[PDB]
Design a protein around this ligand. Structure first.
Ligand SMILES: Nc1ncnc2c1ncn2[C@@H]1O[C@H](COP(=O)(O)OP(=O)(O)OP(=O)(O)O)[C@@H](O)[C@H]1O
Ligand SMILES: Nc1ncnc2c1ncn2[C@@H]1O[C@H](COP(=O)(O)OP(=O)(O)OP(=O)(O)O)[C@@H](O)[C@H]1O
Ligand SMILES: Nc1ncnc2c1ncn2[C@@H]1O[C@H](COP(=O)(O)OP(=O)(O)OP(=O)(O)O)[C@@H](O)[C@H]1O
Lengths: 67, 1121, 390
């Protein structure tokens, strides 16, 4: 509908994540969620770097886009 | 304790406002304080209604003025905003005894105004406004009485304010000239006015400051009197005399009525205007010319029927000041607004409400800058005002509120048609105004009269020569945009003559020096020659201290004081004495920043004043971040960066700005949608007008510098207001720049002192000259001038040589010379030919070896240094043994010599802290090489951004949100305290150009590299960057959709070109891949070679066969393999 | 203008070609070929209207050659007031080019109709909301509403308005409602749906000199009416001169009712204080040349042209030869205002504007206006010939 839509779909394929979707408290919540999910999988990820790396890796693994 | 005290003084200790703020009063008692403070806007509007001039005060200003009714200190400080002509209130014994004008004139009141704590600001200010009107009238009455009795003009000027003496003189002149018009006796009266002119002109030389100003203005008026009287004396018939006399303004007094303040009126062309007796002080008066008089005639004709006045024409012809002088002649002061596209229906409607209720005359400057939509929408309000005045209505409705219509108002518009960024008025709006063309002012008369006032020996000859010389320059100079020799240039010359009168002696020498200082700094070589020759043809005929200050500043900072550099410093220094607005135009890297920093530092040495400089990047910031914005949802104004700086300077809470200069540098391209907002700031108005209604003055010591490299989209509206300094060529030679760069790089570091001598000897200018000269002949992809590539050479060479300090203590002289020589050759190679192709680089190695000497250490394709001894990369390539599954990995790079060379040079550049740009065809391996190089490091983390057409600075900052912390200027640091950040910028050249050809994101990156910081817009604070590096990559600026990047950006980064690997290289790489795969099926491993050959052959033939000339998406690259 | 002449010629041909004989048809086609410059020739004349047309074409009276068709066949022509007064519709769209606006035509209309006309310009949300409310009110209660510059807010023209107009196609139940819309012919496209349901009127200047002075005079103590008559002639002549862009004035200019109104105000103000009949004609000339009309003029040559016309008209002679036709004597102070108005109206109505008024009345070279007039005729005739072929 807008060119802004492209700016998302470009980013989403240039990089696994869209940083604009997880700013401020949205970032904090994400990490918290990841921690819980991490604990639910028997994994040990301590830092925000480890958690976010796992997040983006899983995104790259699971999401497929068909235009 | 601040917030409670602030709202207590405002809201707490006040039991009268509770009848209008009972909720906030109770809420304050309970106490959130901030929200209550923001909730008082309704009461502030109530208070504005009780004193219309309050519309020119901000909400904070009303809070202060309402609060401190017990001191009467703050109310004085706002006179400059409420009345304009009045600086302050003169109190005594808790009563007002007078007011002090801007020029320093003191107006006494007929009766002291007794003040009480219970009397609110609006009440006794209304009393003061009536008293000021009465006092001005009283002095007019008495002065006219004495002058008419036969008192001499020279013994009355020292007794009364300027307005009284002026209006008495005008009324008497009208009466006496009309009596002369009754007959043909004009000779006697011409002689009388001539004698008065001589007397005042001689008295001028023996006077105080105020008396001097009064006499100068009276001399302007009397020169007009004499010119008119002479013309009537020289008419042929009675009808000619009547025809001429009907066209000038006549000052009559209703001596037969009872109404005092309305007793004086002005007659012109059969129409009458009412004199107001508002106090205006002692403003600079305009020399009278025919154009000025005809403009007054049209304005009178329009005001007779209550139509809006309008002036149109090219920039620099005196429209707005004609409007102001008309207002001055009618005993009133015109409020001037600077229109912008930040205005909309609400802003213009509110401003019209203010002008309506005040009874003021308002002038809207640059009226075309309003967008089309608001120009259409506000026509209804314009029409309603006209109809209300014509009919005689008592109220009009604006913005859904009925407000009184003060029957004194007028609306004037000044517009420049046909300029970039301007719009067109719709027909139903133009029909409400009476237009008049102001295309060409009579510059000769202006020059003659100004010179006559200044006491020059021969005003006629000098005026003729000056105006003729300006015309000759405008006719003979080359065709360039920034050549304007119109009225503003004449005023610049004449104003610069004033401080130089005693330097040269009231003669031609002053004029020629002023001409040189004003005009030469803006000319090129051809036009410099033309100027000097023409000045010699037309005209007949000690800086040591500041020169030494400049020498000291330059040498201390470390910049070579070349002759060109000193010349430009001197021109800048002389220009900035009288110009508060300077533009510095020159090529990227030519030395504008060096020039203005050196000159300001020299001035600091000379005068002993402090210098605070703010550097703003106009294009990176949006207008709502630069000039501020009103949030209409709350009607709350919030300052931008420039507005915040100006407000803080004006506040001057600690007096820190009283013995200092304030410099604001706009370090980006001039843009007519940004800079024009400051028109009334740059020109004689010296006022910043904000949409909310505030009017911030510009201090006399507040200077603005513009730094750019072009004047393509800049209109004469800005070029003719600012003094312009033109840099034709770089300010210094290559040798001087290398000396500076080497000194700065070394100083940033016994051992280092002998190493410095060795390095300096190695950069022997003799051979570098030829190396640069023949380097200029190569093909440079996304290239930069040699002058802006030297920085990479020096920086990388110093870094590389210092990196081997640990092993220099045990070397002999030959070894030290060889290591230094090889490192400098390699650094020079990558600095000059780094952006060229492989064959060009090898040929350039050959030329380097040729010019540094047969007996020097040889540089070769793959030479290197190992722990010391000399070796080559070609012998240091390990083999790789992959397992089959590892062909699916993204982080595998099969090693090869060309890869090793790229990785080594990239890592060396990054360690030296030089920003990096990679350039090459798609798939050539830019990101792969950059990822592999930093993958195995322990010093850097990598943050990647993908740039695109519609990305902005916001995306770039958001990319660092999870990697960086803001730590109290403010600092931005990586979250980790052990590694730095390398911020990749993928496809840096895709972001599109705006309507004026600029990339805001690339300029933002330039600011990050050059200034190591940026402005945080919501808080308007400076953020310093400590440990973030900038690298990026792009395709060459020849592929479709790529935007060429300006030299001002690319000069700050080394550029490395990365082409495709050769056929044999691809064959070997993919043979290794197939060898890895065939481990799955080892019985076919004998076919590893032919399969790789087939794949590479098929790739090559597909790439050659199916080109983009068939389909836009037929792109083939090694990625497919 | 152009399309009105093209339509006049086209309909004349469509009627006569089938009504009249073949020789009539072939003559008219030869004549269109002559005017369009596509073909030479002489019609067979035995048929005096074709002859009169032939006299105009030979004599290079090209605008007269075009007006021949319109005058010969068509016996009526409507104005804005005719369209509004005689129409089953209640929505009206007026259109013009840049620097031409007929809002005053509507205000004069509304005053003559004793109707309350409210004018709202569009382009902002405030005016849009107020306009929606006022549109609703003038229907349940009545009144005239004008929406100026609707193209400024197409996003509202193409939504709300594209809707309410169809709803009022339906109600037709209130007699005292009329909505007026203005737009620019050089602007953006309005939605076909809406333009189709609206009475469309094109506003433009009157082409003829005598027609212009006649209209201005019809819109309106002996000195007052006499000066008004002279001013009407002056306005007509100067406005006609503006049509010769490369020969009349150096630059294109526009003059409108406000300049006439200001000149009238100044003339009345001068007459008010000169009871001796010693009218300061020099002051009148200088003011009209310099301020009322000269204010728009930014070139010395064009202002000199204006000064020449002022010197010609407001000379103050006893009997002015304002054109090669009518001579205007001065009034007698013994006559009544009605008497002098009748005399001046008789002087105006008794004369004839010649075929070459573009030269003689404007004092232009006849070879200069020839290219102008002939090229207009060429375009009109070429378009008509193309239409007739199809
Ligand atoms: N009669 C006069 N006497 C002295 N100076 C004059 C006179 N008339 C004009 N000037 C000079 O003209 C300049 C005033 O021009 P002004 O600021 O009104 O320009 P402008 O038309 O508003 O410009 P722009 O179109 O760029 O906004 C000042 O230099 C003023 O000194
Ligand atoms: N007199 C001098 N002697 C030696 N080096 C100099 C001298 N003047 C300038 N330089 C060098 O030349 C360059 C001048 O660039 P500067 O920082 O002044 O910006 P600029 O030319 O205005 O460019 P831009 O508009 O891109 O910021 C710097 O490398 C400075 O070190
Ligand atoms: N040892 C190697 N040498 C050269 N190329 C290799 C090697 N190993 C793999 N490659 C391939 O080389 C190509 C490198 O291109 P890469 O994908 O890095 O493009 P890029 O630099 O990001 O391009 P663009 O500018 O189009 O975004 C990839 O196909 C990679 O698989």
């Amino acid at each position: 509908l807008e060119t802004a839509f492209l700016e998302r779909m470009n980013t989403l394929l240039a990089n696994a994540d869209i940083p604009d979707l997880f700013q401020g408290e949205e970032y904090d919540k994400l990490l918290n969620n990841l921690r819980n999910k991490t604990r639910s999988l028997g994994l040990l990820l301590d830092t925000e770097q480890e958690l976010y790396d796992w997040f983006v890796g899983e995104i790259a693994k699971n999401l497929h886009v068909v235009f | 304790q601040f917030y409670w005290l602030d709202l207590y003084g405002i809201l707490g200790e006040n039991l009268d406002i509770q009848n209008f703020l009972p909720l906030e009063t109770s809420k304050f008692k309970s106490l959130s304080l901030k929200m209550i403070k923001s909730s008082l806007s309704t009461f502030l509007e109530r208070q504005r209604r009780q004193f219309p001039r309050f519309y020119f005060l901000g909400n904070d200003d009303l809070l202060k003025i309402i609060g401190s009714g017990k001191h009467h200190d703050q109310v004085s400080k706002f006179m400059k905003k409420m009345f304009g002509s009045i600086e302050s209130i003169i109190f005594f014994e808790d009563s007002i005894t007078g007011v002090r004008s801007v020029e320093g004139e003191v107006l006494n009141l007929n009766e002291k105004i007794e003040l009480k704590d219970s009397i609110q600001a609006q009440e006794w200010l209304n009393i003061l406004d009536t008293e000021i009107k009465l006092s001005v009238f009283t002095q007019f009455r008495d002065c006219l009485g004495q002058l008419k009795d036969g008192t001499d003009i020279e013994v009355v000027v020292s007794k009364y304010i300027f307005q009284a003496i002026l209006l008495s003189a005008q009324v008497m002149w009208t009466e006496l000239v009309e009596k002369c018009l009754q007959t043909n006796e004009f000779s006697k009266y011409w002689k009388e006015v001539d004698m008065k002119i001589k007397g005042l002109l001689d008295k001028l030389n023996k006077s105080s400051d105020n008396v001097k100003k009064k006499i100068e203005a009276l001399l302007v008026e009397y020169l007009h009197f004499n010119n008119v009287i002479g013309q009537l004396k020289n008419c042929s018939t009675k009808e000619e005399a009547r025809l001429l006399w009907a066209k000038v303004q006549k000052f009559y007094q209703k001596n037969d009525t009872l109404d005092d303040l309305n007793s004086v009126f002005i007659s012109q062309s059969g129409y009458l205007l009412q004199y107001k007796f508002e106090y205006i002080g002692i403003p600079e008066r305009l020399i009278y010319t025919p154009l000025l008089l005809v403009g007054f005639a049209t304005l009178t004709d329009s005001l007779h029927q209550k139509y809006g006045g309008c002036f149109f024409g090219p920039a620099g012809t005196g429209k707005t000041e004609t409007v102001k002088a008309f207002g001055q002649n009618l005993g009133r002061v015109v409020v001037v607004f600077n229109c912008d596209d930040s205005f909309d229906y609400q802003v213009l409607s509110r401003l019209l409400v203010g002008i309506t209720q005040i009874g003021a005359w308002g002038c809207f400057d640059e009226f075309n800058r309003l967008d089309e939509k608001v120009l259409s929408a506000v026509s209804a309000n314009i029409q309603q005002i006209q109809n209300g005045l014509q009919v005689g209505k008592s109220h009009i409705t604006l913005l859904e509120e009925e407000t009184p219509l003060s029957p004194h108002t007028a609306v004037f518009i000044t517009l420049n048609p046909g300029y970039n960024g301007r719009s067109e008025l719709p027909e139903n709006l133009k029909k409400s105004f009476r237009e008049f063309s102001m295309k060409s002012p009579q510059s000769g008369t202006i020059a003659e009269m100004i010179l006559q006032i200044m006491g020059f020996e021969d005003s006629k000859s000098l005026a003729s020569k000056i105006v003729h010389f300006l015309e000759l320059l405008s006719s003979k100079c080359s065709s360039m945009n920034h050549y304007h020799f119109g009225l503003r240039t004449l005023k610049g010359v004449l104003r610069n003559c004033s401080p130089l009168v005693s330097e040269f002696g009231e003669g031609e020498k002053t004029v020629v020096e002023s001409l040189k200082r004003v005009i030469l700094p803006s000319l090129g070589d051809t036009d410099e020659l033309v100027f000097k020759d023409e000045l010699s043809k037309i005209f007949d005929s000690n800086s040591k201290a500041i020169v030494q200050c400049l020498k000291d500043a330059g040498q201390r900072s470390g910049f070579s004081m070349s002759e060109e550099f000193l010349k430009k410093c001197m021109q800048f220094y002389y220009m900035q004495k009288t110009q508060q607005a300077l533009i510095l135009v020159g090529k990227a890297g030519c030395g504008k920043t060096a020039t203005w920093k050196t000159v300001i530092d020299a001035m600091a040495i000379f005068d002993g004043h402090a210098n605070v400089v703010y550097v703003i990047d106009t294009k990176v910031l949006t207008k709502e971040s630069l000039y501020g914005s009103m949030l209409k949802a709350t009607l709350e104004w919030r300052d931008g960066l420039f507005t915040s700086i100006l407000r803080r300077v004006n506040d001057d809470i600690t007096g820190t700005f009283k013995n200092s200069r304030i410099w604001v540098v706009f370090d980006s391209d001039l843009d007519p949608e940004y800079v024009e907002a400051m028109n009334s700031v740059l020109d004689d108005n010296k006022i910043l007008t904000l949409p909310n209604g505030e009017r911030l003055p510009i201090p006399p010591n507040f200077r603005i510098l513009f730094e750019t490299d072009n004047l393509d989209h800049t209109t004469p509206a800005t070029i003719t207001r600012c003094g312009l300094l033109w840099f034709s060529t770089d300010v210094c030679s290559i040798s001087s720049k290398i000396d500076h760069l080497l000194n700065k790089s070394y100083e940033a570091l016994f051992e280092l002192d002998k190493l410095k001598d060795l390095i300096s000897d190695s950069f022997d200018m003799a051979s570098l000259t030829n190396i640069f000269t023949c380097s200029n002949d190569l093909v440079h992809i996304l290239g930069v001038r040699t002058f802006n590539k030297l920085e990479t050479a020096v920086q990388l060479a110093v870094h590389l040589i210092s990196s081997y300090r640990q092993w220099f203590q045990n070397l002999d002289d030959k070894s030290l010379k060889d290591v230094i020589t090889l490192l400098i050759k390699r650094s020079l190679l990558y600095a000059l030919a780094g952006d060229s192709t492989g064959e060009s680089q090898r040929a350039f190695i050959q030329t380097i070896n040729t010019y540094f000497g047969h007996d020097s250490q040889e540089l070769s394709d793959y030479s290197t240094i190992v722990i010391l001894s000399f070796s080559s990369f070609c012998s240091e390539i390990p083999s790789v043994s992959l397992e089959a599954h590892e062909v699916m990995r993204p982080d595998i790079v099969i090693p090869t010599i060309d890869t090793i060379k790229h990785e080594k040079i990239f890592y060396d550049l990054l360690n030296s802290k030089r920003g990096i740009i990679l350039c090459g065809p798609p798939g050539s391996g830019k990101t792969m090489i950059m990822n592999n190089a930093l993958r195995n490091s322990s010093l850097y983390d990598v943050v990647g951004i993908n740039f695109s057409k519609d990305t902005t600075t916001e995306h770039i900052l958001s990319a660092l949100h999870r990697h960086t912390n803001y730590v109290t200027g403010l600092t931005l640091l990586p979250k980790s305290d052990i590694k730095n950040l390398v911020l990749f910028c993928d496809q840096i050249n895709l972001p599109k150009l705006d309507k004026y050809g600029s990339q805001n994101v690339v300029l933002f990156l330039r600011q990050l590299m050059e200034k190591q910081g940026f402005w945080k817009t919501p808080e308007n604070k400076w953020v310093t960057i400590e440990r973030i590096h900038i690298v990026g990559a792009c395709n060459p600026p020849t592929d479709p959709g790529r935007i060429p990047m300006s030299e001002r950006f690319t000069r700050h980064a080394a550029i490395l070109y990365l082409g495709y690997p050769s056929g044999k290289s691809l064959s070997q790489i993919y043979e290794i891949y197939y060898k890895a795969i065939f481990k799955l099926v080892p019985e076919f491993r004998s076919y590893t070679e032919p399969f790789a050959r087939a794949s590479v052959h098929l790739y090559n033939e597909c790439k050659a066969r199916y080109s983009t000339g068939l389909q836009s998406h037929y792109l083939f690259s090694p990625r497919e393999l | 203008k152009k399309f009105k002449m093209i339509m006049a010629m086209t309909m004349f041909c469509l009627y006569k070609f089938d009504i009249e004989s073949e020789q009539y048809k072939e003559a008219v086609l030869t004549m269109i070929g002559v005017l369009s410059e596509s073909s030479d020739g002489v019609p067979k004349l035995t048929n005096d209207d074709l002859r009169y047309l032939w006299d105009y074409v030979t004599t290079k009276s090209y605008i007269s050659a075009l007006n021949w068709f319109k005058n010969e066949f068509f016996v009526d022509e409507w104005n804005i007031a005719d369209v509004v007064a005689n129409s089953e519709n209640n929505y009206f769209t007026m259109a013009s080019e840049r620097d031409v606006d007929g809002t005053f035509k509507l205000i004069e209309l509304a005053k003559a109709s004793k109707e309350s006309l409210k004018i709202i310009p569009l382009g902002s949300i405030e005016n849009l909301n107020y306009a929606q409310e006022e549109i609703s009110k003038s229907k349940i209660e009545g009144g005239w509403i004008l929406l100026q510059n609707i193209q400024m807010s197409l996003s509202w023209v193409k939504t709300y308005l594209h809707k309410h107009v169809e709803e009022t196609k339906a109600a037709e139940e209130h007699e005292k409602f009329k909505m007026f819309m203005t737009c620019h012919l050089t602007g953006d496209k309005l939605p076909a749906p809406l333009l189709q349901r609206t009475d469309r009127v094109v506003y433009e200047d009157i082409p003829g000199i005598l027609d212009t002075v006649k209209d201005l005079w019809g819109s309106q103590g002996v000195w007052s009416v006499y000066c008004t008559f002279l001013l009407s002639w002056f306005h007509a002549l100067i406005t006609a001169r503006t049509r010769l862009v490369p020969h009349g004035f150096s630059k294109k200019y526009y003059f409108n009712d406000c300049d006439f109104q200001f000149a009238s105000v100044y003339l009345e103000n001068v007459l008010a204080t000169n009871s001796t009949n010693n009218i300061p004609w020099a002051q009148v000339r200088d003011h009209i040349a310099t301020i009322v009309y000269g204010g728009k003029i930014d070139e010395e040559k064009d202002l000199e042209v204006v000064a020449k016309l002022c010197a010609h008209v407001f000379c103050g002679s006893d009997n002015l030869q304002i054109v090669p036709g009518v001579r205007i004597p001065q009034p007698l102070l013994q006559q009544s205002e009605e008497e002098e108005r009748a005399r001046l109206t008789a002087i105006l109505s008794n004369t004839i504007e010649p075929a070459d008024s573009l030269s003689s009345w404007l004092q232009l070279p006849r070879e200069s206006i020839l290219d102008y007039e002939r090229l207009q005729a060429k375009e009109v005739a070429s378009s008509t010939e193309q239409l007739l072929q199809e």
